[PDB]
Amino acid sequence: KFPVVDLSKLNGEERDQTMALINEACENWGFFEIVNHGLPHDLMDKIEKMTKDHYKTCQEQKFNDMLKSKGLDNLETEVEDVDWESTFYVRHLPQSNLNDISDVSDEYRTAMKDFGKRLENLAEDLLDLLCENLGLEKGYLKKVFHGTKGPTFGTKVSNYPPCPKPEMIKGLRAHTDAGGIILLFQDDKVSGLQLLKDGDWIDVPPLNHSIVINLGDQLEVITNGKYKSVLHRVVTQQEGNRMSVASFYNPGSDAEISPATSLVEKDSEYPSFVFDDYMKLYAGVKFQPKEPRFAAMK
Amino acid sequence: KFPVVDLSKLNGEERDQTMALINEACENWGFFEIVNHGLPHDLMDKIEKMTKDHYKTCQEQKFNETEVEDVDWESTFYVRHLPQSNLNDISDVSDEYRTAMKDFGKRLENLAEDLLDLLCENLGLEKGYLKKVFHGTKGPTFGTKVSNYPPCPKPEMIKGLRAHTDAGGIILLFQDDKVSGLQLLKDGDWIDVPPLNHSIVINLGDQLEVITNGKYKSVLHRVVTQQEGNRMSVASFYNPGSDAEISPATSLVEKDSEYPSFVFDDYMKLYAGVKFQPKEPRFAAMK
Amino acid sequence: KFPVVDLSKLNGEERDQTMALINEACENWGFFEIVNHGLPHDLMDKIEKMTKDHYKTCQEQKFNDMLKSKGLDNLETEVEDVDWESTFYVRHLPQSNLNDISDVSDEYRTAMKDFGKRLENLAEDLLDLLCENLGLEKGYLKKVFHGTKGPTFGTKVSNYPPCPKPEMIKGLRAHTDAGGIILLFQDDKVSGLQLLKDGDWIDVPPLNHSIVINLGDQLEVITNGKYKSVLHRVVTQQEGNRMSVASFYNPGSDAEISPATSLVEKDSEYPSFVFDDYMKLYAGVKFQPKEPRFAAMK
Amino acid sequence: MKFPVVDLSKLNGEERDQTMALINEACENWGFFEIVNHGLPHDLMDKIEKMTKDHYKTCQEQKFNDMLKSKGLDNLETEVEDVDWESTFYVRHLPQSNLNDISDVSDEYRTAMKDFGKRLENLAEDLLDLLCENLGLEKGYLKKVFHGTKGPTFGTKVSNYPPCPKPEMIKGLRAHTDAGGIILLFQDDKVSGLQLLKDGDWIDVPPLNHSIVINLGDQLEVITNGKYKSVLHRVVTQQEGNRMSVASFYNPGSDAEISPATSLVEKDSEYPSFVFDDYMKLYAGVKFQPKEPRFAAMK
Amino acid sequence: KFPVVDLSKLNGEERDQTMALINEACENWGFFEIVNHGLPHDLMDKIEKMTKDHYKTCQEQKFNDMLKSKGLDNLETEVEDVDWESTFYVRHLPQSNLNDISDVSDEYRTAMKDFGKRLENLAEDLLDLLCENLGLEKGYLKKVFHGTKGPTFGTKVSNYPPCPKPEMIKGLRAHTDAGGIILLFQDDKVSGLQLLKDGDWIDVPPLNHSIVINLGDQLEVITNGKYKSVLHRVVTQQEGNRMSVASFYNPGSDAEISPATSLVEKDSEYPSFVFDDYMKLYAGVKFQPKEPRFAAMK
Ligand SMILES: O=C(O)c1ccccn1
Ligand SMILES: O=C(O)c1ccccn1
Ligand SMILES: O=C(O)c1ccccn1
Ligand SMILES: O=C(O)c1ccccn1
Ligand SMILES: O=C(O)c1ccccn1
Ligand SMILES: [Zn+2]
Ligand SMILES: [Zn+2]
């Protein structure tokens, strides 16, 4: 059963049990859903509606332009080198480009700014729960992530349109995320996101007004492997356009990333590096195995 | 006019003038300061902070009447980065200091190689030539000497470090930005290497004098003490590998060279015993 | 782009450009940094070393005993009524108390006296540049500031020690300065001082051997609002102790302060008052809005 | 992208700051603006307009048709880029008035023109003082700069743009920037035609009853060190409609020294320092060529 | 310092800095000289000799004829409506008229043909360097320029003979060029060509065996203003006849010109049009301001 965490149970004497659920999702799933997370359901509903309307208005034509430009009109053999995906990226931190994206509406930009700020505070709240579960001092992960200019925080807004031949192409090929903590607002009707657990692909179930959390490669390093970043993918379907609004809380470019000493006894197998060196490498090898990227930092 | 090179001026119309200043420093100064070098000022501030605080906790107590010309008024420990790091084996260094030194050392190694490629361009050598010469079998040798020069009641009796030339390739110095002391010998005068915030001091060692057939000479330098003030020094040495073959680059030689061809580790074995004696007998000894 | 004025550029016709830059900073920034100001760099280096050593020797434990008496160990909630600040004050004029600060060395007292005299001369040179830019006669501002016993001149020696939770407390809360012209020798590594400009907090960047200049409330009155006194604050940080040696060149206590008539066309909105009445009021309301203090002098 | 209209009566009251800020925005971003409630009597504007239009019909229209005949512009077979489809005469007010020397004007027109020009000269100097305040200059700075030895130069160009059968072949007045200081235009309130270039589009300066159109010339671009630029403008023709134009030019005296104001120059200016009459002698010959070479020619 | 680019440094490890110089000249100068290009120095020397000998035998007559019918033998005052210039035009593409110019020699035509082909290939190589510097796809600008019949490529062969009173008339009045990329073989002793930069006329220095490159109006549109076409002129002198062999690589007549979408964020201020409509208009208004010609294409 996929972990669903009720964050409102942290405000009372059920808080220890909630923390234990968070910790075991972090150790064994790499993913969990959160409900009662404090984000207004009214804000999620308009983010959802304006994301979908901005797709028809602005992204659908770019998407078909892409399928023509790569011959994906007609899928007669398996395509393992492209994602059946429509995306644009919004940067929040350290410097916002929200007011420079030309094709987004005023009210969409205002909703995205509010949504991004609330998710940034929720990311930092979640990192503190991780710290507590890890036996780290409060604020430890936030301070590691800061670097010189503060954390990097952006939002990937994706749609995975219907695919006539889902067997032939993935919406997004299997990978682990490079960063710190990932907070996903996904479609509540159209499924597609899957994680790999114990040798099976497991669906990340659509759930109304929920946020999906998962941990990236940097948290595997800092926890000395105690919390691993898990492989995940998006599969297409013939009917349905799955919406994806995923926010990435990453260390600053010059943050020093290393295994926390209190989590290391035997010499660590994980490297110590500067985050931007990891991200330069990751961009070119995102869909290749994760383990060579750690070795490359030594 | 001590040369200060602005590395941000390399991308542009003004790059020819920046390169000419670098070349002119290499030929006639043997030293130059670089600013806007790409190293984060917050990493330098941490390095300086932890270096000075590591002195007071670990070295200052341990550190505790006529001319003394055979001793250096100096407190030092050494960190090895390449070919193989001993950073996790220096006992008296803290985790934050060790993590900062690893990051700082990696950035200085990349900056050293960028500087070697600027030298190559000014010398008319192909890019990567000096890096390739320095590699040997195991790669270049790269380490950092962390020094403090504490106050001396009688500075005219003892030097912080006696006059010498450096044996190796290129030296990248992060020095105190308030307390002076480092001097180079130029045209028969001792010249101060001026403290400058968030700068790196570059100087060339004996190996680059050989490879350039004397076009860039390694210059004598020293550290003088002072009565008040503890000058910090974080100096990184980018050296050829032990079995690198060092010889004058053929394109810089027309008339037969006066400089020898040798293997770097034979020069270093010799250098250790005669570091404060004249440089010129060390070149002759390699023939 | 924060104004940095090179005082060596007064010696040509760059002088017009330099004067125009000073005027622009006075009108729109309220702050500017000066370089090549004539203060010996070796005297500044001594002042800094001795201030930092006097903090460690005399104030750091005194400071730590204060956070116990005021419960600032645990910053579990926001503190808006205290400054995370260690200070003492040195009065130079009209009457010196330099020989009464008990825990300072002969050599610190002798250096501070020399430093103070040089800053007093630089303050008066700067006031004459303001006079020229305003079209006032030479010495106009010095004469207004004189009163009967001469200007008031003192130095505030501050350190802002590291704060575990900088989000909770300011090093010094937002305020404008009551006085005439303020000449600040600040830490050249540790930032923290910010001014408010166009609705944003802007850092006053550390710059080695520079002096930071800002204008106080009295100059806003004399210029009939042409040069306004700008809000500024000091923020803390988690690792770094920012030093501040700030000298205040203020009118004499019984000086008559009023808008210079040549700067007044329409009847002024600013009061005419005696400086000590302004200062007696300011002491109690320093971190409250500035504008009621002008109204209270009518 | 609304054309700026400034209510000058709002300077007399609590909204003076907001009005000054609007004027400053128009000076930086449009180079043109319309003013209303400007103090010129609406009945004097009506008489000027009536007498200008009747003087065209009785005295200028025959000359205009005869001008085309002599240049063969009866037949707009192809584009004309070197002629203005324009009927004009010029009235000099300062430093020396020639009003009593124009032969074909009535005494009533001459008296109204003298009264109109005097009020416009006073309004020009009032506006220059608003610019001074917005620029941080001393009161009267621009008037003092413009004075030279004999005072400012002030004249009025009285133009009509008669109907043109083929407007796409010829402009009423080709694109240019004005050489001088501040230009105060009383234009037709029905017939449009004046356009300015803004952000790569021609923008109509909309006819507005009893308004005055203000624009800034090349000399104020120099003095403000480029903060207020002189903007390109033109007059287009139409097939029917005769647009009237009464435009007054407040210019520095001939021997006035023009340079960027010292308080606006924090680094070396790209703009020259020169004597105004040298700029004008050059401008007369290259008025419809680019502006920027004229600044370079003064160095 | 006027930009001089060594094109042989593109074949090696200095190529990035060479590209950076090209991009800098394109953004800030609109002009640059190239050395070590592909053109044999003996071909340039022969083009220069035969151009100058063709002036004396064939063009000097037409030039004095011109001065006759325009009354320009004696220059009492400024002439602002004519150029002190002797020209004939050679068309190469889409169709050559080289074998139809009656007064050109066999060997001049053969040299002119070889010269034109090498400059056409150098124009296309240079356009690809601009593409790379602009982040456009390889061949992008050549494809835009093609239309139906291919690019237009021609050569303007000019001489600017000595003028007794150079103050009175220009060799060629200030203008921007209408087309794509302009490749000039100019006199290496007699100067005269100037560009306008930062409010100053700057000489384009004569240099042995060099080619002067500048960008026309079409590249400003396609780059959305990132590379502007800059005003330039030729001044006369009393002693000296400056030679000018200028080759113009322009889009085909029916090419669609518009800002490249990857260079546009906010709505472009530049029009989208068909090139021949721009050229029809330009011919009549060449020496009037540039900006109204862009406005006219909307
Ligand atoms: O696009 C991704 O890589 C993604 C999106 C949401 C959650 C995890 N990963
Ligand atoms: O210790 C040395 O020999 C040294 C240190 C820094 C720079 C140059 N030389
Ligand atoms: O303590 C203050 O109020 C202060 C200090 C330095 C500069 C400005 N203001
Ligand atoms: O005739 C002109 O040049 C003019 C007329 C009115 C307004 C601006 N310019
Ligand atoms: O004749 C021209 O317009 C020209 C000639 C060469 C270079 C630029 N422009
Ligand atoms: Zn992912
Ligand atoms: Zn050394």
Ligand SMILES: [Zn+2]
């Ligand atoms: Zn203050």
Ligand SMILES: [Zn+2]
């Ligand atoms: Zn005009």
Ligand SMILES: [Zn+2]
């Ligand atoms: Zn041209």
